[PDB]
Amino acid sequence: KRGAVDLIKTGVNEKAMAGAVFSLFKKDGTEVKKELATDANGHIRVQGLEYGEYYFQETKAPKGYVIDPTKREFFVKNSGTINEDGTITSGTVVKMEVKNNEEPTIDKKINGKLEALPINPLTNYNYDIKTLIPEDIKEYKKYVVTDTLDNRLVIQGKPIVKIDGAEVNANVVEVAIEGQKVTATVKDFTKMDGKKEFHLQIKSQVKEGVPSGSEILNTAKIHFTNKNDVIGEKESKPVVVIPTTGIIELTKIDSANKNKMKGAEFVLKDNNGKIVVVAGKEVTGVSDENGVIKWSNIPYGDYQIFETKAPTYTKEDGTKTSYQLLKDPIDVKISENNQTVKLTIENNKS
């Protein structure tokens, strides 16, 4: 006398789940069958089973779903048959419904959709970290998203967490922050049942003084433990911000003499007429012995150079005279395809 069983495997949104692999065991642990893969409709059908207690156990999870170690018991108590497509059933066929849950995933982007971003120092940009919220999140034990920002970066204010686009109280999700480490930990798992997207947004700035063109990478990580004590740890793909700055080289010479000049003072202003400040200091220069003023770490890109003090010289009557002051601004442009602007400035006695 022999019975049968029908395993009905489903996934997200009650979808029929194919490719889920199971083994069938007797209660005493002996393997009856292995490599039983759910068909296109999420079914595994087995007949010809001697009466008694059995249990299925998953050996391979469907792609994208969490592995499930649970031993699922059933009794074969009556006779039953079932053909391969289940269109014909006789007697009693034990029915087993097995649900699968997706495993959380992690995605990091810059300003929503970017994987790379050329940006000026001390200029705001966002890290957008989105993780999948599974259908059994309600039953999860741990769900944490972390991100340690490269130390060449400054966290701006307090990172914000959105669930399905809605900002959540510190009750449901707590945003912690210590040093460069940002950590958002789910605290109320019930307030997230039915939700699908965990979105952590960290606002950042690239510090001043990092070499231009240097790639500052970022990644975020998700840590979780589900109801079955399955522990996950995934890391996002790296995203990159690149500091954009340039160099301004001024060489101060004489009109006809063409000689290098020391002592000529200049200043760099933006097109709003305000002096440019870099490391807390205004961008000022005094011409060296070779008549050079080199300014580095200048963000993009439109500025105006002004002479604030002309060089001196001594005529034959020993006179202590200053060259003429240049009263017109010198427009400069800094931007890739023009990252180092070298300008020669001629200086007239009258």
Q: Please report the DSSP string for 239-287 in residue order.
A: EEEEE-EEEEEEEEEETTT--B-S--EEEEEETTSPBPBSSSSB-EEE-
Judge if 108 and 86 occupy the same domain. Answer: no
271 in the same domain as 235: no
Same domain, 121 and 220: yes
Q: Is there a single domain that holds both residue 249 and residue 348?
A: yes
**How many domains does the chain fold into?**
3
> Is 238 found in the same domain as 116?
yes
3-state secondary structure at position 84? coil
Residues 170, 237 within the same domain:
yes
Shared domain check, 173 and 60 = no
The domain that contains 70 carries what CATH number?
A: 2.60.40.10
Strands 160-163 and 166-167: antiparallel
Last residue of a domain, one of 217, 244, 271: 244
Question: Phi and psi (nearest 5°) for 147?
Answer: -160, 115
d(CA 61, CA 65): 6
Decide which of 206, 226, 244 is a domain's last residue: 244
Whether residue 162 is found in the same domain as residue 230: yes
Task: Consult the annotation and say whether 73 binds a ligand.
Answer: yes
Positive or negative: CA dihedral 280, 285, 286, 287: positive
Residues 6+ apart with CB under 8 A from 6: 43, 44, 45, 82, 86, 93, 94, 95, 96
Query: 211: how many CB neighbours lie within 10 A of its CB?
Result: 9
Method underlying the structure? X-ray
Residue 285: CB partners within 8 Å, gap ≥ 6? 250, 265, 266, 267, 293, 294, 295
Say which CATH number the domain at 180 has. Answer: 2.60.40.740
- Residue 271 shares a structural domain with residue 349: yes
List phi, psi (to 5°) of 138: -50, -30
Range of the domain at 45: 1-103
**Whole-number Å distance between alpha carbons of 9 and 157:** 46
Rounded-to-integer distance, Cα 341 and Cα 296, Å: 11
How far from the centroid of its chain's Cα atoms is residue 243's Cα? Answer: 17
Burial of 131 (0-12, 13-18, 19+ CB in 10 A): buried
Q: In sequence order, what are the residues at sequence separation of 6 or more whose Cβ sits closer than 8 angstroms to the Cβ of residue 320?
A: 312, 314
Of 187, 216, 244, the domain-final residue? 244
249 annotated ligand binder: no
Place of tokens 């150079």: 305
Examine the domain organization and report whether 116 and 233 are in the same domain. yes
Q: What is the resolution of this structure in A?
A: 2.1
- 69 and 139 housed in the same domain: no
Of residues 274, 215, 285, 271, the one with CA closest to residue 243: 215
Q: Is 179 helix (H, G, I), strand (E, B) or coil?
A: coil
Q: How far apart are CA 24 and CA 120, in angstroms?
A: 61
Bridge-based pairing state of the strands 340-347 and 245-254:
parallel
- Cα angle value 84/89/90 (rounded, 5°): 130
Tokens describing residue 177: 């922050």
